[PDB]
Design an enzyme around this catalytic site. Structure first.
Site, PDB file in Angstrom:
ATOM      1  N   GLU A 112      -8.989   1.993   9.175  1.00  0.00           N
ATOM      2  CA  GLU A 112      -9.444   1.727   7.825  1.00  0.00           C
ATOM      3  C   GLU A 112      -9.618   0.224   7.594  1.00  0.00           C
ATOM      4  OE1 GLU A 112     -10.548   1.491   3.968  1.00  0.00           O
ATOM      5  OE2 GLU A 112      -8.715   0.520   4.574  1.00  0.00           O
TER       6      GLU A 112
ATOM      7  N   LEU B  98       0.845  -1.183   0.000  1.00  0.00           N
ATOM      8  CA  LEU B  98       0.000   0.000   0.000  1.00  0.00           C
ATOM      9  C   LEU B  98       0.886   1.242   0.000  1.00  0.00           C
ATOM     10  CD1 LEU B  98      -2.681  -1.535   2.432  1.00  0.00           C
ATOM     11  CD2 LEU B  98      -2.802  -1.267  -0.028  1.00  0.00           C
TER      12      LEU B  98
HETATM   13  N1  LIG Z   1      -5.514   0.109  -2.249  1.00  0.00           N
HETATM   14  C1  LIG Z   1      -6.195  -1.028  -2.003  1.00  0.00           C
HETATM   15  O1  LIG Z   1      -7.455  -1.036  -1.432  1.00  0.00           O
HETATM   16  C2  LIG Z   1      -5.627  -2.373  -2.351  1.00  0.00           C
HETATM   17  C3  LIG Z   1      -4.387  -2.401  -2.967  1.00  0.00           C
HETATM   18  N2  LIG Z   1      -3.807  -3.589  -3.326  1.00  0.00           N
HETATM   19  C4  LIG Z   1      -2.697  -3.457  -4.303  1.00  0.00           C
HETATM   20  O2  LIG Z   1      -2.881  -3.966  -5.621  1.00  0.00           O
HETATM   21  C5  LIG Z   1      -1.604  -3.863  -6.257  1.00  0.00           C
HETATM   22  C6  LIG Z   1      -1.287  -4.965  -7.277  1.00  0.00           C
HETATM   23  O3  LIG Z   1      -2.293  -5.235  -8.239  1.00  0.00           O
HETATM   24  P1  LIG Z   1      -1.943  -6.253  -9.459  1.00  0.00           P
HETATM   25  O4  LIG Z   1      -0.505  -6.063  -9.826  1.00  0.00           O
HETATM   26  O5  LIG Z   1      -2.977  -6.076 -10.515  1.00  0.00           O
HETATM   27  O6  LIG Z   1      -2.001  -7.693  -8.715  1.00  0.00           O
HETATM   28  P2  LIG Z   1      -3.245  -8.667  -8.324  1.00  0.00           P
HETATM   29  O7  LIG Z   1      -3.396  -8.663  -6.846  1.00  0.00           O
HETATM   30  O8  LIG Z   1      -4.506  -8.409  -9.050  1.00  0.00           O
HETATM   31  O9  LIG Z   1      -2.624 -10.069  -8.787  1.00  0.00           O
HETATM   32  C7  LIG Z   1      -2.481 -10.214 -10.187  1.00  0.00           C
HETATM   33  C8  LIG Z   1      -2.669 -11.644 -10.648  1.00  0.00           C
HETATM   34  O10 LIG Z   1      -4.026 -12.059 -10.496  1.00  0.00           O
HETATM   35  C9  LIG Z   1      -4.392 -12.925 -11.539  1.00  0.00           C
HETATM   36  N3  LIG Z   1      -5.487 -12.290 -12.302  1.00  0.00           N
HETATM   37  C10 LIG Z   1      -5.763 -10.946 -12.425  1.00  0.00           C
HETATM   38  N4  LIG Z   1      -6.864 -10.803 -13.199  1.00  0.00           N
HETATM   39  C11 LIG Z   1      -7.297 -12.039 -13.560  1.00  0.00           C
HETATM   40  C12 LIG Z   1      -8.375 -12.503 -14.330  1.00  0.00           C
HETATM   41  N5  LIG Z   1      -9.032 -11.684 -15.136  1.00  0.00           N
HETATM   42  N6  LIG Z   1      -8.546 -13.866 -14.492  1.00  0.00           N
HETATM   43  C13 LIG Z   1      -7.678 -14.759 -13.907  1.00  0.00           C
HETATM   44  N7  LIG Z   1      -6.616 -14.289 -13.163  1.00  0.00           N
HETATM   45  C14 LIG Z   1      -6.442 -12.969 -12.991  1.00  0.00           C
HETATM   46  C15 LIG Z   1      -3.133 -13.111 -12.382  1.00  0.00           C
HETATM   47  O11 LIG Z   1      -2.418 -14.128 -11.718  1.00  0.00           O
HETATM   48  P3  LIG Z   1      -1.302 -14.978 -12.492  1.00  0.00           P
HETATM   49  O12 LIG Z   1      -0.150 -14.047 -12.854  1.00  0.00           O
HETATM   50  O13 LIG Z   1      -0.864 -16.068 -11.541  1.00  0.00           O
HETATM   51  O14 LIG Z   1      -1.913 -15.664 -13.688  1.00  0.00           O
HETATM   52  C16 LIG Z   1      -2.421 -11.799 -12.147  1.00  0.00           C
HETATM   53  O15 LIG Z   1      -1.062 -11.823 -12.543  1.00  0.00           O
HETATM   54  C17 LIG Z   1      -0.596  -3.934  -5.113  1.00  0.00           C
HETATM   55  O16 LIG Z   1       0.100  -2.726  -5.048  1.00  0.00           O
HETATM   56  C18 LIG Z   1      -1.409  -4.082  -3.834  1.00  0.00           C
HETATM   57  O17 LIG Z   1      -0.847  -3.374  -2.725  1.00  0.00           O
HETATM   58  C19 LIG Z   1      -4.411  -4.796  -3.076  1.00  0.00           C
HETATM   59  C20 LIG Z   1      -5.666  -4.902  -2.455  1.00  0.00           C
HETATM   60  C21 LIG Z   1      -6.403  -3.654  -2.031  1.00  0.00           C
END
Ligand SMILES: NC(=O)C1=CN([C@@H]2O[C@H](COP(=O)(O)OP(=O)(O)OC[C@H]3O[C@@H](n4cnc5c(N)ncnc54)[C@H](OP(=O)(O)O)[C@@H]3O)[C@@H](O)[C@H]2O)C=CC1
Ligand SMILES: COc1ccccc1/C(C)=C\c1coc2nc(N)nc(N)c12
Length: 186
Positions: free
Chosen positions: A30, A22
């Protein structure tokens, strides 16, 4: 189980992430709101459900996985078995949503919550049909790698109130924030 609820916290520059965590220091108050909202089902004997991406799953401290008293689904195209502690693995958002509607899970699941990360919010926001965005506005800029998708006010109605959600500006460790709920119907 039909409406999709996304819940996120976003900085003033629409930041949600930096280096896999984060952008801000831990906001435990929060967090309590995230816990309350995602955990509190509307019916005794049913649990809410959280869907999250694979990176977000592994970014939760292992001692806090699965998210307690919710059914946890992890999205991944590469894992072949659910991560340890996870209830289900899906290879796509569509797969996960199809699963949730199965009669096998009807007396088991109440609310569905999307809980991160970036990529999952993006795809959830691409869905037609009933979406809510529970957005915590962190009222300060923070250096960020990743950003929440634009919230088009033509599409999402900012609700003036929502049951169980307090509207007053909150503060924790000198960081102000407030809770908002947006809704896109159909
Ligand atoms: N501000 C907030 O409220 C929140 C923030 N965060 C943040 O989110 C950020 C990262 O996001 P991001 O990089 O997108 O990572 P994600 O947490 O979304 O993980 C990504 C992985 O999820 C899988 N995935 C995503 N979309 C799909 C789909 N359409 N179908 C099947 N699998 C899918 C894939 O896995 P694979 O590669 O294995 O195939 C992908 O590489 C971080 O900075 C974290 O801190 C997290 C939660 C809440
Ligand atoms: O990362 C996390 C790290 C620890 C525990 C849970 C989460 C997750 C998955 C998500 C969140 C943690 O705090 C949050 N606040 C809001 N408003 N929305 C969210 N999705 C989360």
């Amino acid at each position: 189980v039909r409406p999709l609820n996304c819940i996120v916290a976003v900085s003033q520059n629409m930041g949600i992430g930096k280096n896999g965590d984060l952008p801000w220091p831990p906001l435990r108050n929060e967090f309590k709101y995230f816990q309350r909202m995602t955990t509190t089902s509307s019916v005794e004997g049913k649990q809410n459900l959280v869907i999250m991406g694979r990176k977000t799953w592994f970014s939760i401290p292992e001692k806090n996985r699965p998210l307690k008293d919710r059914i946890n689904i992890v999205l991944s195209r590469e894992l072949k078995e659910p991560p340890r502690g996870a209830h289900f693995l899906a290879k796509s958002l569509d797969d996960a949503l199809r699963l949730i509607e199965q009669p096998d899970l009807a007396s088991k699941v109440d609310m569905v919550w999307i809980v991160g990360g970036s990529s999952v919010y993006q795809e959830a926001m691409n869905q037609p049909g009933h979406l809510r965005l529970f957005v915590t506005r962190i009222m300060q800029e923070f250096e960020s790698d990743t950003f929440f998708p634009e919230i088009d006010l033509g599409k999402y109605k900012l609700l003036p109130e929502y049951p169980g959600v307090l509207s007053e500006v909150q503060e924790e460790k000198g960081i102000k924030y407030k809770f908002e709920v947006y809704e896109k119907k159909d």
